[PDB]
Amino acid sequence: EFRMEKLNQLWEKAKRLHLSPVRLAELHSDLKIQERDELNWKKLKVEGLDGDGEKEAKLVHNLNVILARYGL
Amino acid sequence: XXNXX
Amino acid sequence: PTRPPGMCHLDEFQCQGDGTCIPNTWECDGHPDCIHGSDEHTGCVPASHTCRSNEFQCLSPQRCIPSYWFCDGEADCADGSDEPDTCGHSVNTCRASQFQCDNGRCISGNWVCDGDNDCGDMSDEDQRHHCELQNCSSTQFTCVNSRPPNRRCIPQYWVCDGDADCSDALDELQNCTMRTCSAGEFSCANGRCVRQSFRCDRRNDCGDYSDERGCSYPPCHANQFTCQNGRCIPRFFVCDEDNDCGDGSDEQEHLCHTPEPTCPLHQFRCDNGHCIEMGRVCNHVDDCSDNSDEKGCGINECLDSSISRCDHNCTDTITSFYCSCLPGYKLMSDKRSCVDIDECKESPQLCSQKCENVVGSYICKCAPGYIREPDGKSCRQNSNIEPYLIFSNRYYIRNLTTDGSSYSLILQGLGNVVALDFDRVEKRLYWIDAEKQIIERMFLNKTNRETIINHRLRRAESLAVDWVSRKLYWLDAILDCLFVSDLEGRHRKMIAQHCVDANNTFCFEHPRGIVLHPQRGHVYWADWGVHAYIGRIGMDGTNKSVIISTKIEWPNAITIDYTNDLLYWADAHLGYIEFSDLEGHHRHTVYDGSLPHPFALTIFEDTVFWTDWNTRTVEKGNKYDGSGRVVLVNTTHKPFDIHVYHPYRQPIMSNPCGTNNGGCSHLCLIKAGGRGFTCACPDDFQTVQLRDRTLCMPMCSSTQFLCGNNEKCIPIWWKCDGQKDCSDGSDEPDLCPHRFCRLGQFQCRDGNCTSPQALCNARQDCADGSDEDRVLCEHHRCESNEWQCANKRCIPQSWQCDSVNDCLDNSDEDTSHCASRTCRPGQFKCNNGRCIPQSWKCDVDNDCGDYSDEPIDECTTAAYNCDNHTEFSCKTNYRCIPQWAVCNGFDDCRDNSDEQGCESVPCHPSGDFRCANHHCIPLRWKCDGTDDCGDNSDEENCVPRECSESEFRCADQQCIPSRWVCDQENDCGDNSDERDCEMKTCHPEHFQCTSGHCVPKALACDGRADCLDASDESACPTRFPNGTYCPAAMFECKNHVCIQSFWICDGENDCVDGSDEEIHLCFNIPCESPQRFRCDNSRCVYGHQLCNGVDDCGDGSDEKEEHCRKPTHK
C-alpha cells in the first residue's frame, strides 16, 4: 500500500492501537498526503537540488503533530 | 504395531 | 575336478543354445561354430519569458521542470505528454545517473536499501541488492532476534510502550519487566499479558508464542481454504501466485491446474491454443490468431533438403509436419532428431535374464548355467537339480517345492525362527531364534546341530551367509547396527552404525532384511523407521550410501536375483513389489499396491516367491509383471524369510582371501567393488595399523577376561564355570574356585549369586560388595546404546538431561554436561539439553519440555510438508502422521482429525477384516483370542483353530507349544497340560522326575531341587571325594539337596525332604529379635511372621499381643 517502510510501520501500529476507524482513516489521509510531500523531499535530497532543505522541517513537524494529534 | 514380530 | 552342475569350467566357454561347453579359443573368432553362433557375439573384437533553458515548460501550475525529470515513469508537472510521446520509450535504458530498476522506471542509488517503494513495485530491495542488516541510530532500538519479513529497527518512541512491536516483542521486556497484570488479560509464560481475544489465533502477539501454544484451532469456514499447516485463507486467495500461508499449500502445481480441453477427434485446434472445428482449417478464413489455419493450404515441409532436419522419417498434415523415429529410437526434446533406446535400462522386462544394448534393437542373453528356450527371450536352468523353497514358521523350518506339490518339515520345536539362510559349500543351514536370542546352524541332512552365537544378541532381525568369504552378516534392531562374523561365530565386529546419508536423515532405527552381493562387495539392507530407506555398505564397512528413499514406508523384504543384477524389495504398507538397478535408478513396480503385507521375497529364474503375513500365505508369480500369481501354501503361523535353495542362487566366485585368510590376523573382509580385501579386528580389539600389516591389539574392559591365545575376550562372569569358552582353555584354570552359581550368573567372593547387570551399577548387591570393587569397575565399559556416568554406572543413551536422577550423582542431569554434549547422529537437540529423534521436531507435541522442538514460525513453513505418498496431514494443525494411523482407534493428530469418517475408508480387498466399527485390521488378527477392533467384533462368531505339528491342545481347545507339557507348571489355565505325565516320554535331552514331570537335563545333579519332588537330586553320585554332596558353606539336606546355610529353619520349607526344619537344628541357629525370634516351641520363627494372624508355630505365641503390639510405635 504505502510507499515507505515507516508509514507502513505506523499503519500496523495504529491498528495495534485499535483506534476508532474515523480517526484511523484520517491518519492515512494525513500520511498519504505526506507521502507525496516526502517523495519530492527525497528527489530534491538525492539530486541535491534542495539547497536550503526547506522541505524537511515541514514534514518532520507535521509527523510529530500527527503523532500527538491522533493518540500515538 | 502391525509390523513387529 | 568335475564340472559344476549345468555349468562349465572357467577354462572353457558355454554355448547358449544347448548348454554345451567349448574352449574359449572358439569364441570371438568370426566363425559361428556353436549351435546358434553364441560364440560369435558382436561384442567381441571386429511565453518564453516564464521558464528558462534548464527547465521544461508546463501549463497550469505555472511551473517549469528539469529535462531529465520527464519521461522517467510519471508525469512530473501533470503533463499528458510527459511519459507517452516526449522521449523514446526504449531507445535507451535509463542511464547511469539513475541505476537500472525495471524497464519502465529507474532508481538513483540509495533507494535500493531504505525499504520505500522506489521502483514502483518494491523490487528495489529485491534479491541481494542492499540492506542485509539495518542499523539504529540514537532514539532507535534494533529487533536483533528477527528476520527480514518482520522488522529490524524501531524508535525509542515504541520501547516499553503499551503495544508489542518487534518480532519477539523484546522491546517491551528490556529492563522494564513490570509486574501488574490481572485476570482481565491472558497471562504469558514470560510474564507479559495480552487481551483474551489475542489467544489461539494467527498472530504472534506475546512474542513468547505462549498465546498460541497448546491451543486447539476449530476448523475453518466453508469459504475458507485450509493449508497443510492449519492456516485458514480465503478461497479467493488460492492460486493467485502469492504464498498466502507460508508452506505453499495454496500455491502448488496440480491444485492450481487447468488442464487443456481434450478435443480428441474432429475439433482441430490451432496453434494459438483454442479448440475449433476441423473443417475451419484452410477454409480461406483467418479464424485463428495469426494465420494458424491458413498456409494458403499446407504441404509437407520436410520435402525441401533438411528443413526442420527430420533425422529418421517424416510425415505431414493439413497445416504442419511431424517427424518420426524407427522402433528402437526415440525423439528427444528438439522434436527433430532421434537417439538410441537403452532397452536394458529403459525396459528391463523385455529380456528374462540379461540384456545387451545395440544401436536400434536389443539382444537377450543368459547367465552361465542357463539356456535360452526357443522363444528367444526365456532362459531355462540347465542343472538337473530342481530348486525348492525353504521358509520359516515361528516353530518350524519347512520344505516346499517350487510348484507347491510337496510340503514337509525340515525342523520343528523351535522358539521363534524369524530369519534363515543357507550355505551351499557345506550344505549347511543357519537361522535366528528370536525367542531364545541365539543363532544356530545344522547340516541339511538334519545332523550336527549347534549354536554359534548366544551372547549380546539383544534383538537380531535378519541374517545372510557369505558363501565366498565364509562370513556371516546379521542386523540388530536394538543396537541399530550391522554385525559381521565368521561362519563359526567368532571375531564379531561392528561394521555400521548411526546414520548413512551425509545429512544424517536416514539412520539405523528399525533394520530388517539383508542381502549380500559378493560380486561387487556390497551389503544391502532395509529400514522401516520414520525415514524408511534401503541402504548400502561395502562388505568391509565402507561406501555407506542410500539407494531408495522415496515412496517407501515398510520395506520388510529385500533380495537380489544375481542374473539381471536387479535389486528387489517389497513394501508392507504401500503393498507393492518394486525392482530397480543396483544404484537405485529405473524403478519399476511389479504389483501396484495390491499385496496385503509381504515380509520376504526371493527370486528364481522367472518367478518371484514371497511370504504374506496378513493372509499367512506363500505366493509366487512372474518377476516382471506379476502375471500368473499362484498361492503355494497357507499356514497357521506367520511365514518368515523364505529362501530358494539352489546352487545357482549362490553363484561361484573366487575368494580374495584364498587359502591364507588374506594374511589377516583375525578377519579378511571383501573390499567395496569386490576386487580387494581388507583386514579387520573384532569388537574388543584395537587396530594399530603398521607399515605392512594391521595389528589387532587386544583391548578389553576390566569386566572382561582375555583368553590364552588372545583369540577373543569374554565377560568376567564367563570365567570359572562349568563350560570352557576360550579355545586355549584358560577360561577354566587349575586354580579355579568352586562354582556355587548357575550358568550366566555372577558369583560373589563369599558364594552368593547375582545377575550380571548387578556389576558396577553403584548399588552393592553381593554380600561382600565385590560387584562394586574398584579393580573390577575401574575400566568398566558398556554397549553402544548406553551412556556411562562418571559414577561408572551405565544408563540408556536417551536417559540424559531429562530432569530425572537416573544415575545416583546426577551426572546425567549435570548442567555442565547438559550444555556441551551433542546428540548422536540423526537426533535433534533442545535448549533444555534433551536429545530427541529428528522426527519429533515440528509435531505439535511438546517433547523438549521447553517447546524448542516446536518453533511455530519455522514448523509451519514449506520445509516440513508431509510426504504425500505415505503420510496424512492433520486438519487443524501442522502435524503429519503415517497413513496407517488413520482411524486406528487412537487420537494421533491431537485433534481427532485422523479418526473422522472412517466409514468412507475401504479395507484392502483381501488382507483386512472389517470390524463392527469401520476400522480395518489385519486378517491374521481374526479369532486370535484378543480384542483388537476395540469392540470385540473380531473375536465374536469364532471357532477355535486346529493345532499344528509342534502344538498340543488343551481342554479349552486352545493350542500351546508341546514343550510346555509336563513342565511342573500349567499354561492352559487348568490341569489340562499336566493331566498325566507318569506314562509319557518327554522331548529328548530332558530328565524325567519320578513324579512324571520332566526338566531340561542340565538341571540334574546340581544341588538345587529343580524337580518339584526333588527327584533330580535324590539319586546322584557323591559330589566331593570324602563323600559330601555340598560344599560346607551350603547345608546338606538328607535327600542330597544343596541349600544356602542361612536358609536353615527360617520357616520356609526349603528342602523338599524337610531336613531344613529339624527342631534340634532350629534351636541352635543364631537369631535376632527384629529379624528372627524364638517361638516357645524352640523354633526361631521369622520376624516378619509376628502379629501376622497366622499360626506359624503351634501355640499362637507369634500372635500374642503382649510382645508384638507397638510399645513405642517401633
Ligand SMILES: *[C@@H]1O[C@H](CO)[C@@H](O[C@@H]2O[C@H](CO)[C@@H](O[C@@H]3O[C@H](CO[C@H]4O[C@H](CO)[C@@H](O)[C@H](O)[C@@H]4O)[C@@H](O)[C@H](O[C@H]4O[C@H](CO)[C@@H](O)[C@H](O)[C@@H]4O)[C@@H]3O)[C@H](O)[C@H]2NC(C)=O)[C@H](O)[C@H]1NC(C)=O
Ligand atoms: C551331511 O552332509 C554334510 C555335508 O555334505 C556331510 O559332511 C561331510 O562329510 C564328509 C564325509 O562323508 C566329509 O568328508 C571328509 O572331509 C575330510 C576333511 O574335511 C573334514 O575335516 C577337516 C579337519 O579340519 C574339517 O575342517 C572339515 O570341516 C571336515 O570336517 C577328509 O579328510 C575326509 O577324507 C577321508 O575320507 C575320504 C572318503 O570320504 C577319503 O577319500 C580320504 O582318503 C580320507 O580317508 C573326508 O573327505 C566332509 O568334510 C563333511 N563336510 C564338512 C563340511 O565337514 C555329513 O557327513 C552329512 N551327514 C550325514 C549323516 O549324512
Ligand SMILES: *[C@@H]1O[C@H](CO)[C@@H](O[C@@H]2O[C@H](CO)[C@@H](O[C@@H]3O[C@H](CO[C@H]4O[C@H](CO)[C@@H](O)[C@H](O)[C@@H]4O)[C@@H](O)[C@H](O[C@H]4O[C@H](CO)[C@@H](O)[C@H](O)[C@@H]4O)[C@@H]3O)[C@H](O)[C@H]2NC(C)=O)[C@H](O)[C@H]1NC(C)=O
Ligand atoms: C551370602 O553368603 C554368605 C556366606 O558366607 C553370608 O555371609 C555370612 O556367612 C556366614 C557363614 O559362616 C554367616 O555366619 C557367620 O559365621 C562366622 C564364622 O563362625 C566362626 O566361629 C565358629 C565358632 O565355632 C567357627 O566354627 C567358624 O569356623 C568361624 O571361626 C561368624 O564369625 C560370623 O559372625 C561374625 O560375622 C558376621 C558377618 O560375617 C557378623 O554379622 C556377626 O555379627 C559376627 O561379627 C557369622 O556367625 C554370616 O551370618 C553371614 N553374614 C551375615 C551378615 O549374615 C551371607 O549371609 C549371604 N548373603 C546374605 C545377604 O545373607
Ligand SMILES: *[C@@H]1O[C@H](CO)[C@@H](O[C@@H]2O[C@H](CO)[C@@H](O[C@@H]3O[C@H](CO[C@H]4O[C@H](CO)[C@@H](O)[C@H](O)[C@@H]4O)[C@@H](O)[C@H](O[C@H]4O[C@H](CO)[C@@H](O)[C@H](O)[C@@H]4O)[C@@H]3O)[C@H](O)[C@H]2NC(C)=O)[C@H](O)[C@H]1NC(C)=O
Ligand atoms: C569333604 O570335601 C570338601 C571339599 O572337597 C570339604 O570342604 C572343605 O573344607 C575346608 C575346611 O573348612 C575348606 O577350606 C577352608 O575354606 C575357607 C573359605 O575359603 C573359601 O573361599 C576361598 C576364596 O574363594 C576359596 O579359596 C576356598 O577354597 C573356599 O571356597 C578358608 O577361609 C579356610 O582357610 C581359613 O583357615 C585357615 C586355617 O585353617 C587360615 O589359616 C586361613 O587364613 C583362613 O582363615 C580354608 O581354606 C574348603 O574350602 C572346603 N571346600 C568346599 C568345596 O567346601 C569338606 O570339609 C569335606 N568333608 C569332610 C567331612 O571333611
Ligand SMILES: *[C@@H]1O[C@H](CO)[C@@H](O[C@@H]2O[C@H](CO)[C@@H](O[C@@H]3O[C@H](CO)[C@@H](O)[C@H](O)[C@@H]3O)[C@H](O)[C@H]2NC(C)=O)[C@H](O)[C@H]1NC(C)=O
Ligand atoms: C521412414 O524413413 C526411413 C528412412 O529412409 C525408411 O527406412 C528405409 O526403408 C526402406 C524401405 O523398407 C529401406 O529400403 C530397403 O533397403 C534394402 C537394403 O537394406 C534394399 O535391398 C531394399 O530394396 C529397400 O530399398 C531402407 O533400407 C530404409 N532405410 C534405412 C537406412 O533403414 C522407412 O521405410 C520409412 N518408413 C515409413 C513407413 O515411411
Ligand SMILES: *[C@@H]1O[C@H](CO)[C@@H](O[C@@H]2O[C@H](CO)[C@@H](O[C@@H]3O[C@H](CO)[C@@H](O)[C@H](O)[C@@H]3O)[C@H](O)[C@H]2NC(C)=O)[C@H](O)[C@H]1NC(C)=O
Ligand atoms: C526338500 O524337499 C525336496 C523334494 O522332496 C528334497 O529333494 C530330495 O532330495 C533327496 C536328496 O538329494 C533326493 O533323494 C535322492 O533320490 C535319488 C533317487 O531316488 C537316490 O538315488 C539318492 O540316493 C537320494 O536318495 C530326492 O530324490 C529329492 N527329491 C526331489 C524331488 O528332488 C530335499 O532333499 C528336501 N530338503 C531337505 C533339506 O530336506
Ligand SMILES: *[C@@H]1O[C@H](CO)[C@@H](O[C@@H]2O[C@H](CO)[C@@H](O[C@@H]3O[C@H](CO)[C@@H](O)[C@H](O)[C@@H]3O)[C@H](O)[C@H]2NC(C)=O)[C@H](O)[C@H]1NC(C)=O
Ligand atoms: C541437507 O538437506 C537440505 C535440504 O535438501 C540441504 O539444504 C540445501 O541448502 C542449500 C544452501 O543453503 C539451499 O540452497 C539455497 O537456495 C536458495 C534459493 O532457494 C539460495 O538463495 C541460497 O543461497 C542457497 O543456494 C538448498 O535450497 C537446500 N536444499 C533444498 C533442496 O532446499 C542441505 O544442503 C543438506 N545438507 C547440508 C549441507 O545441510
Ligand SMILES: *[C@@H]1O[C@H](CO)[C@@H](O[C@@H]2O[C@H](CO)[C@@H](O[C@@H]3O[C@H](CO)[C@@H](O)[C@H](O)[C@@H]3O)[C@H](O)[C@H]2NC(C)=O)[C@H](O)[C@H]1NC(C)=O
Ligand atoms: C562408493 O560410493 C559411491 C556412491 O554410491 C559410488 O558411486 C556411484 O557409482 C555408480 C556406478 O559406477 C554411478 O552410476 C553411474 O554414474 C555415471 C555418471 O557418473 C553414469 O554415466 C552411469 O550411467 C551410472 O549411472 C553413480 O553415479 C555413483 N554415484 C556417485 C555420485 O558417487 C561408488 O561406485 C562407490 N564405490 C565402490 C565401488 O564402493
Ligand SMILES: *[C@@H]1O[C@H](CO)[C@@H](O)[C@H](O)[C@H]1NC(C)=O
Ligand atoms: C489355502 O486355503 C484354502 C481355503 O481357503 C484351500 O482351499 C487351499 O488348498 C489352501 N492352499 C493350499 C494349496 O494349501
Ligand SMILES: *[C@@H]1O[C@H](CO)[C@@H](O)[C@H](O)[C@H]1NC(C)=O
Ligand atoms: C503428491 O503426490 C503426487 C502423485 O499423486 C506427486 O506427483 C507429487 O510430487 C506429490 N507432492 C508432494 C507434496 O510430495
Ligand SMILES: *[C@H]1O[C@H](CO)[C@H](O)[C@H](O)[C@H]1NC(C)=O
Ligand atoms: C566335481 O567338482 C565339482 C566342482 O564344482 C563339484 O565339486 C562336484 O561335486 C564334483 N563331482 C564329484 C563326483 O565329486
Ligand SMILES: *[C@H]1O[C@H](CO)[C@H](O)[C@H](O)[C@H]1NC(C)=O
Ligand atoms: C517319548 O515318546 C513321545 C511320543 O512318541 C515323544 O516322541 C517323546 O519325545 C519321547 N521321548 C522320549 C524320551 O523317548
Ligand SMILES: *[C@H]1O[C@H](CO)[C@H](O)[C@H](O)[C@H]1NC(C)=O
Ligand atoms: C563320591 O564321589 C567322589 C568324587 O570325587 C569320590 O569318588 C567318592 O569316593 C565317591 N564316593 C563316596 C562314598 O564318597
Ligand SMILES: [Ca+2]
Ligand atoms: Ca567361433
Ligand SMILES: [Ca+2]
Ligand atoms: Ca516523467
Ligand SMILES: [Ca+2]
Ligand atoms: Ca526503496
Ligand SMILES: [Ca+2]
Ligand atoms: Ca512496544
